[PDB]
Nucleic acid binder design. Structure first.
Ligand SMILES: [K+]
Ligand SMILES: [K+]
Ligand SMILES: [K+]
Ligand SMILES: [K+]
Ligand SMILES: [K+]
Ligand SMILES: [K+]
Ligand SMILES: [K+]
Ligand SMILES: [K+]
Ligand SMILES: [K+]
Ligand SMILES: [K+]
Ligand SMILES: [K+]
Ligand SMILES: [K+]
Ligand SMILES: [K+]
Ligand SMILES: [K+]
Ligand SMILES: [K+]
Ligand SMILES: [K+]
Ligand SMILES: [K+]
Ligand SMILES: [K+]
Ligand SMILES: [K+]
Ligand SMILES: [K+]
Ligand SMILES: [K+]
Ligand SMILES: [K+]
Ligand SMILES: [K+]
Ligand SMILES: [K+]
Ligand SMILES: [K+]
Ligand SMILES: [K+]
Ligand SMILES: [K+]
Ligand SMILES: [K+]
Ligand SMILES: [K+]
Ligand SMILES: [K+]
Ligand SMILES: [K+]
Ligand SMILES: [K+]
Ligand SMILES: [K+]
Ligand SMILES: [K+]
Ligand SMILES: [K+]
Ligand SMILES: [K+]
Ligand SMILES: [K+]
Ligand SMILES: [K+]
Ligand SMILES: [K+]
Ligand SMILES: [K+]
Ligand SMILES: [K+]
Ligand SMILES: [K+]
Ligand SMILES: [K+]
Ligand SMILES: [K+]
Ligand SMILES: [K+]
Ligand SMILES: [K+]
Ligand SMILES: [K+]
Ligand SMILES: [K+]
Ligand SMILES: [K+]
Ligand SMILES: [K+]
Ligand SMILES: [K+]
Ligand SMILES: [K+]
Ligand SMILES: [K+]
Ligand SMILES: [K+]
Ligand SMILES: [Mg+2]
Ligand SMILES: [Mg+2]
Ligand SMILES: [Mg+2]
Ligand SMILES: [Mg+2]
Ligand SMILES: [Mg+2]
Ligand SMILES: [Mg+2]
Ligand SMILES: [Mg+2]
Ligand SMILES: [Mg+2]
Ligand SMILES: [Mg+2]
Ligand SMILES: [Mg+2]
Ligand SMILES: [Mg+2]
Ligand SMILES: [Mg+2]
Lengths: 163, 197, 258
RNA sequence: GGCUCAGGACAACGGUUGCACCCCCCGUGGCGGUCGCCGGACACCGCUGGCAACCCGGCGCCAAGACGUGCGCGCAAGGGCGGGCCCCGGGCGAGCAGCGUGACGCAGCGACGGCCCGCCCGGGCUUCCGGGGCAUCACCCGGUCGGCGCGGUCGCGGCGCGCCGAGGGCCCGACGCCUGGCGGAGAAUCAGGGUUCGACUCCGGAGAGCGGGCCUGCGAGACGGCCCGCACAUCCAAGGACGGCAGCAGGCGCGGAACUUGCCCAAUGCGCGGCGCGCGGCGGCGCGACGGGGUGCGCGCGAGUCAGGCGGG
């Protein structure tokens, strides 16, 4: 079926290369999960056993505000930005590294301490916080992440500027 | 032939056979599916059948003709030779129509039901002989080696908690504790050693 | 292929087994266990081929079913069990106890040993590593594992193990001037003293040794086994790890038919 | 394990590296802490059937070292913080591996105690050098060369996809075409230097009429497993069912050219432990080829014949 064997590529001088065997089982690939937002995780048997979890339709995650170290479990509300393609944002597909809006309720108990980023407290004062997925949902069936801060936060806030 | 109707009564345990024209016309039985009630005034619940050429009915195909299907190991109408082997086969002569040369039927809620067949085999599991005789399945004298069976090759009760088997299990537990105790002592020795060093 | 190899042609068997090229298409294939395929000997090749206690394969099996053979104190009922360097070989009904070492031609020999010696074993520390919940472990040349080792034991040292408890009672450090024996290569089997250790960043570390007659030789650090501290902790064959030259070997051969 | 050499020329293959990018049954050491004896049902089998034969149907009593659920001192995968701001032991040449701490999660092992860890053999890819002929084949390539991000995989990688740039190779022979092209260890010839061939014994690779696809398993893109298209055959009541000798013998065809449709697991080994095995062994045919001795000597032998040994399953 799908293979990641290199026998089908040209050489580095552009030359066509011949075929000297048929497809081997250990060189197979599978189709991607295309994990949707808003709960199923399928099981995949792999080489030697070694179960892989493959998520479809995740809703929640566990998130960390690293600087003050406030970790809760929160609901992922919307995929807002993706580096690879804007098609992956329009569909709310969950992949590693995409920028999301998560629910502000679990972190409202963190509204009291000052000397805590006002670029995070003002986020909390509303309805959602900007965060980033840090796991591979197709390989482990899970979608967790961290809360953006620093120059990264500003870079993505200008990427989502109302312009 | 025309149609051999294998009736089978499980309330008593008997099996009987009949015949019928079952030709192309009205036949108030036609158009019914497997696991359906009919009123049996011409011969009750259908459970299977073979058509001409002896192809068996298959549940769910929802057709009155034959069909091919990729049957998988564990399913009916197929006996595999290797683990994981599948096979394409032909099935389902009708949802009962004129084609069938045989029908299989069971009787519900009762020529008339007369014979009562004995049960050849007797209960074997240890609990199977305590539900029969109303005995409790919770005591410290569960031995139950009554030997009657009415001399009816089959007994050798299973799942009996004897004395030696009780000792065996207790011994295994008493060693599964010794491992943990010695392991914790060794860990303590090593921690103290690094403390001295 | 599509999976592991279970056969071994006779011409493809290791050359120090001294198998003869007629009398068989096949050779025994050693089972996995304490020793690897190349640096071992199948147990059958000692009982039938060498000592003639058995004379065929089938009657070599029945000796090992009724458990007349102990390896390191345990009865092994498997004819292709891999026995190797430093394994204790004791047959009780004939009262024979041996230690398995190398001779000066890289072949396995059995050295008679006393009942006061067969209760311990020398192992080579192959690696130290952290296992489960961060605990330290050491691994040897026998596929043996020891948890919570004393912090002094480092890699390339040798340890001494009682053969009933399976615990450590002594260790020898790898140093300059230690007595050593080479376990493989082309100086396999001969015994000397370490006089150099040259490390090469990224690559193999070479060891220079010198025999008791003063002959010097070299090999890789993965082939030098410490047998004591200026005195071997065990018994060694009569030749004591001195290798003749081809001329002196020829004169000793001429003298046997003489 | 056995067979073959069709494909494939910066492949494969040979020596030489690496995985701090990996997976691994059995065996041999370890290790073993997990938020009162349960259930019902399947085959063999009984009673009845269908069918030309291939193959199956229905009802019913019955077990487990089979399942399923589980009694238990919390800990499987993945994730956020915990490094030093000339230059440099747990373990390295190399900041690697563990642990702590906040959040998720609830996996695996428990109804005869094993999840897990090291080794071992095996595999996957991978560094450097070697790796056919033709110039009446001089320019070639466009996922082609590099970058960024995700996916997929046992795993790295243009392996795939989106976006960005214009690279990459060449008379030290690229690209294209051809080969009655499997590679090595080796073999034939013979002062020294060379020439020619590498079907077949060992090692490695690839295939099972030709394309593809896949399940079960630690391991297969398996063909003495399954599914489909094509080209060919097989039985048949005409409804259907069904095949793969480049395994061992044997046959047809083709060619200048190549043997018995034998006996046996006694040996050498392999799977389960007592058997199995056309691996392999023993006979048969065999002027391909090798080695030894005769058709006399001055008077004793061999080739045959018949018996007993020895040998041999
Ligand atoms: K594939
Ligand atoms: K494969
Ligand atoms: K199968
Ligand atoms: K092969
Ligand atoms: K395998
Ligand atoms: K195998
Ligand atoms: K051989
Ligand atoms: K041989
Ligand atoms: K051979
Ligand atoms: K073996
Ligand atoms: K052949
Ligand atoms: K070929
Ligand atoms: K295997
Ligand atoms: K390579
Ligand atoms: K290379
Ligand atoms: K290479
Ligand atoms: K090269
Ligand atoms: K040319
Ligand atoms: K492109
Ligand atoms: K890429
Ligand atoms: K692309
Ligand atoms: K481009
Ligand atoms: K050329
Ligand atoms: K050819
Ligand atoms: K010459
Ligand atoms: K020449
Ligand atoms: K020459
Ligand atoms: K010449
Ligand atoms: K040949
Ligand atoms: K071959
Ligand atoms: K070959
Ligand atoms: K070979
Ligand atoms: K081979
Ligand atoms: K091979
Ligand atoms: K081969
Ligand atoms: K192959
Ligand atoms: K082919
Ligand atoms: K084929
Ligand atoms: K084919
Ligand atoms: K094919
Ligand atoms: K195929
Ligand atoms: K494999
Ligand atoms: K395939
Ligand atoms: K295929
Ligand atoms: K045949
Ligand atoms: K052929
Ligand atoms: K034959
Ligand atoms: K002819
Ligand atoms: K002819
Ligand atoms: K045999
Ligand atoms: K096996
Ligand atoms: K044969
Ligand atoms: K004579
Ligand atoms: K004679
Ligand atoms: Mg193939
Ligand atoms: Mg929109
Ligand atoms: Mg199978
Ligand atoms: Mg093979
Ligand atoms: Mg461009
Ligand atoms: Mg060749
Ligand atoms: Mg060849
Ligand atoms: Mg041949
Ligand atoms: Mg095969
Ligand atoms: Mg195939
Ligand atoms: Mg001819
Ligand atoms: Mg002669």
């Amino acid at each position: 079926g799908i293979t990641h064997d290199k026998m089908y590529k040209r050489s580095k001088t552009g030359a066509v290369q011949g075929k000297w065997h048929k497809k081997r089982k250990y060189n197979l690939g599978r189709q991607p999960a295309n994990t949707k937002l808003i709960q199923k995780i399928s099981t995949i048997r792999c080489r030697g056993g070694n179960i892989k979890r493959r998520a479809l339709r995740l809703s929640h995650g566990s998130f960390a505000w690293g600087s003050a170290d406030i970790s809760h479990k929160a609901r992922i509300l919307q995929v807002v930005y993706n580096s690879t393609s804007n098609e992956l944002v329009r569909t709310n597909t969950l992949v590693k590294g995409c920028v999301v809006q998560i629910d502000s309720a679990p972190f409202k108990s963190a509204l009291s301490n000052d000397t805590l980023d006002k670029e995070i407290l003002d986020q909390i004062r509303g309805d959602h916080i900007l965060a980033r997925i840090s796991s591979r949902p197709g390989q482990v069936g899970t979608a967790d992440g961290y809360i953006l801060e620093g120059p990264e936060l500003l870079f993505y806030q200008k990427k989502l500027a109302p312009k | 032939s025309f149609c051999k109707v294998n009736i089978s009564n499980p309330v008593t345990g008997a099996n009987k056979s009949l015949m019928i024209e079952d030709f192309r016309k009205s036949q108030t039985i036609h158009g019914l599916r497997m696991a359906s009630e009919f009123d049996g005034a011409a011969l009750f619940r259908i459970t299977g059948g073979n058509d001409a050429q002896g192809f068996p009915m298959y549940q769910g195909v929802l057709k009155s003709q034959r069909a091919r299907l990729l049957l998988r190991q564990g399913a009916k109408c197929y006996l595999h030779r290797r683990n994981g082997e599948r096979k394409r086969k032909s099935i389902r002569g009708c949802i009962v129509g004129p084609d069938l040369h045989a029908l299989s039927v069971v009787l519900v809620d009762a020529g008339l039901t007369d014979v009562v067949v004995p049960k050849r085999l007797v209960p074997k599991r240890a609990s199977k002989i305590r539900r029969l005789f109303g005995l409790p399945t919770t005591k410290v004298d569960p031995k139950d080696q009554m030997l009657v069976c009415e001399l009816i090759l089959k007994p050798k009760v299973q799942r009996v908690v004897t004395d030696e088997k009780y000792a065996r299990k207790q011994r295994v537990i008493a060693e599964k504790k010794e491992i943990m105790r010695k392991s914790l002592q060794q860990l303590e020795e090593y921690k103290a050693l690094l403390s001295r060093m | 292929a599509r999976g592991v190899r279970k056969h071994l042609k006779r011409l493809n068997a290791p050359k120090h087994w001294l198998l003869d090229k007629m009398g068989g298409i096949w050779a025994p294939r050693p089972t996995n266990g304490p020793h690897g395929l190349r640096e071992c000997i199948p147990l059958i090749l000692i009982l039938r081929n060498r000592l003639h206690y058995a004379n065929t394969y089938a009657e070599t099996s029945m000796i090992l079913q009724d458990k007349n053979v102990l390896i390191d104190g345990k009865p092994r009922t498997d004819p292709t069990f891999p026995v190797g360097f430093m394994d204790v070989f004791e047959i009780p009904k004939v009262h024979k106890t041996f230690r398995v070492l190398y001779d000066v031609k890289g072949r396995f020999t059995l050295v008679p040993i006393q009942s006061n010696e067969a209760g311990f074993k020398l192992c080579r520390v192959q690696k130290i590593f952290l296992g489960d919940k961060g605990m330290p472990y050491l691994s040897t040349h026998d596929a043996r594992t020891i948890r919570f080792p004393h912090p002094d034991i480092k890699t390339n040292d040798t340890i001494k193990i009682n053969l009933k408890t399976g615990k450590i009672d002594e260790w020898y450090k790898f140093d300059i001037g230690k007595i050593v024996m080479v376990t493989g290569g082309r100086n396999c089997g001969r015994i000397g003293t370490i006089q150099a250790i040259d490390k090469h960043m990224g690559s193999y570390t070479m060891i220079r040794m010198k025999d008791t007659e003063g002959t010097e030789f070299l090999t890789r650090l993965c082939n030098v086994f410490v047998i004591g501290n200026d005195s071997p902790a065990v018994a060694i064959p009569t030749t004591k790890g001195i290798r003749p030259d081809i001329i002196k070997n020829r004169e000793l051969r001429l003298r046997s038919i003489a």
